[PDB]
Amino acid sequence: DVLAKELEDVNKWGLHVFRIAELSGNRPLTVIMHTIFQERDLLKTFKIPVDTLITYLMTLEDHYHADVAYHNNIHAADVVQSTHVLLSTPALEAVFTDLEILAAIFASAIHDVDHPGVSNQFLINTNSELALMYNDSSVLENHHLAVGFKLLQEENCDIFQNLTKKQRQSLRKMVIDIVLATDMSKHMNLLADLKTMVETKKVTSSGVLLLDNYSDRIQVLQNMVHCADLSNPTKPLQLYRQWTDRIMEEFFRQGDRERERGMEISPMCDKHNASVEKSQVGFIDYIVHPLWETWADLVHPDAQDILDTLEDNREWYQSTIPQA
Amino acid sequence: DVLAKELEDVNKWGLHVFRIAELSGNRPLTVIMHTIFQERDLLKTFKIPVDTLITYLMTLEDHYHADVAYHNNIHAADVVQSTHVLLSTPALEAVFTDLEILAAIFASAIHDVDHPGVSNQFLINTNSELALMYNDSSVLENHHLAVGFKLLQEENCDIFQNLTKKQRQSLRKMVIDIVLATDMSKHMNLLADLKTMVETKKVTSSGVLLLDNYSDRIQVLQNMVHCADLSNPTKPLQLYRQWTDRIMEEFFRQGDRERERGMEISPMCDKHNASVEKSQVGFIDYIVHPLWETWADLVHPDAQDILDTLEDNREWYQSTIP
Ligand SMILES: COc1ccc(-c2ccn(C[C@@H](O)CN3CCOCC3)n2)cc1OC1CCCC1
Ligand SMILES: COc1ccc(-c2ccn(C[C@@H](O)CN3CCOCC3)n2)cc1OC1CCCC1
Ligand SMILES: [Mg+2]
Ligand SMILES: [Mg+2]
Ligand SMILES: [Mg+2]
Ligand SMILES: [Mg+2]
Ligand SMILES: [Zn+2]
Ligand SMILES: [Zn+2]
DSSP states (O other), X not given: OHXXXXXXXXXXXXXXXXXXXXXXXXXXXXXXXXXXXHHTTHHHHTTOOHHHHHHHHXXXXXXXXXXXXXXXXXXXXXXXXXXXXXXXXXXXXXXXXXXXXXXXXXXXXXXXXXXXXXXXXXXXXXXXXXXXXXXXXXXXXXXXXXXXXXXXXXXXXXXXXXXXHHHHHHHHHHHHHHHHTTOGGGHHHHHHHHHXXXXXXXXXXXXXXXXXXXXXXXXXXXXXXXXXXXXXXXXXXXXXXXXXXXXXXXXXXXXXXXXXXXXOOOTTOOTTTOOHHHHHXXXXXXXXXXXXXXXXXXXXXXXXXXXXXXXXXXXXXHTTSOOO | OTHHHHGGGTTSTTOOHHHHHHHTTSOHHHHHHHHHHHHTTHHHHHTOOHXXXXXXXXXXXXXXXXXXXXXXHHHHHHHHHHHHHHHTOGGGTTTSOHHHHHHHHHHHHHTTTTOOSSOHHHXXXXXXXXXXXXXXXXXXXXXXXXXXXXXXXXXTOOTTTTSOHHHHHHHHHHHHHHHHTTOGGGHHHHHHHHHHHHHTOOBOTXXXXXXXXXXXXXXXXXXXXXXXXXXXXXXXXXXXXXXHHHHHHHHHHHHHHHHHTTOOOOTTOOTTSOOHHHHHHHHIIIIIHHHHHHHHHHTTTTTHHHHHHHHHHXXXXXXXXX
């Protein structure tokens, strides 16, 4: 119906993912993954039974928390679809194998599963069972990976059942490498290396990037999924505003639990004292734009429109903050 | 009775740790930890109730598997006692705080807890729940930490209850840093960095090391406990021989599991095709001597005897190849 019409934009930056969420009965991750797997012919390439795929996807989506305002199945679907668009960037044409493509998309789908709506630092500071299990290191991201893989064991859920042993081992490694790179504490190191990769990048005559080993390849996929994870401010304003509403609700819910515990309230988590405009401008200035201008460098000029939107959105949000 | 005369060597390399296990009713970890904590006055410094210490130690010791030949409570006791000795080396006098000493000793005591007697690679290859939990990375070592800390939560087991919040945080970070560094897959990187530290080491007039910050201190502690973990071949030969017998028994049991599942048998785990003595010599040549020669460099000349014993023991296994 209308849904099929909205899913026509699946290859475009700015897909109305919230509409798809409404229209699909709160199943945007399932419907968007299915569409992209069909679009990329992934079922045939990897002999994935369509019943298996949908079963796994619905279980996966089920394990995103409905009551978590940002880190839910809509965010998962958004990162999946954004990664799907970045994979098709002309600078990367025929660079990645189907398995590498499958790894990047699967990693995006699972990358925040079972997210509790609080940060790693909160989990560490409250002596959580999760932090105890993971020794305070990439606590959430390790857990997302564990849950995402573990769900493959449920009945008729093994979508990788017809991969070779070699393929499965390789996919598992890449997926781990990619989701661990979504840990924000690794952002500055990822960025510093991505900048150096750009400085020395090699291209064919056709202008596609030359990535001739695993380290270079996985580094590009890591930063690709990281960009997609941090892509909200690069989206049309009507979408970006909705993401901003959700993250601040999630942050203030964490702030409320911190205040109740007599804890220092984390930056941007105090509903009484935070400023949304200032918060987003700082986010863009110190995190999102430095990352995206570096990606844009890597794939120039593929991402110029994305970078333009980001810069317009930054200009917009700063316009109501009084300045000298 | 006789346990007390053996415990007099708790300050010595080559403590009769197997004797201690027998004489203590297979409580070598509890006995040795209690002795060290009393010796270093750690109960008073950190206000650790003695019953709480003993209760935690007994529970920790119970979570080392009695049916695992090498990675059991005797190995934990050995690495604890060996770290205790390394910490007292003259070149390290007054270098570490009591909290750093506590962290090294606690890390040593928990560093292989709940070890199942199979390798990280075996756990990964067999798609174990543990490898699934830890995404194939430092699977055992992450697990040893989780268990060692979790046991603090059992009744009357929180030996850190009277540390400040900041002290707990700092100790927790150090213990994690140390135990994750015992993952053998990190040996080459750890050693490479230890060589770098030796090349640029700063000592006072009396040859005491001058560490400048957390990075320096934690690096020395990481390598110290790694040395203690890999100290078997530097011990008096009779100790070394028993340790070799035990690790081969545990390796062989893993190979039996691999063979039974139709897997490639891991290096040195095939009881039908082993060269125990040749393998100990290769172990020393490629892993243990390069590490201990580098440690000996750092604390020169404190570890000269240890190095000499290593080289003697190398010749024992060499002259013992059929
Ligand atoms: C739609 O907007 C967002 C979507 C995803 C996130 C997000 C993921 C992880 N973080 C948290 C910090 O690790 C990074 N911070 C950020 C701002 O200052 C610098 C260091 N944030 C944030 C968004 O913005 C928040 C608005 C209040 C602050 C950020
Ligand atoms: C007394 O000698 C040893 C004392 C301790 C170790 C030791 C402790 C932990 N490890 C790591 C393994 O648990 C993991 N390995 C990975 C590859 O092979 C299978 C299992 N090894 C080894 C010793 O020697 C081995 C026998 C021949 C040389 C090596
Ligand atoms: Mg995340
Ligand atoms: Mg170990
Ligand atoms: Mg008290
Ligand atoms: Mg220094
Ligand atoms: Zn995310
Ligand atoms: Zn050990």
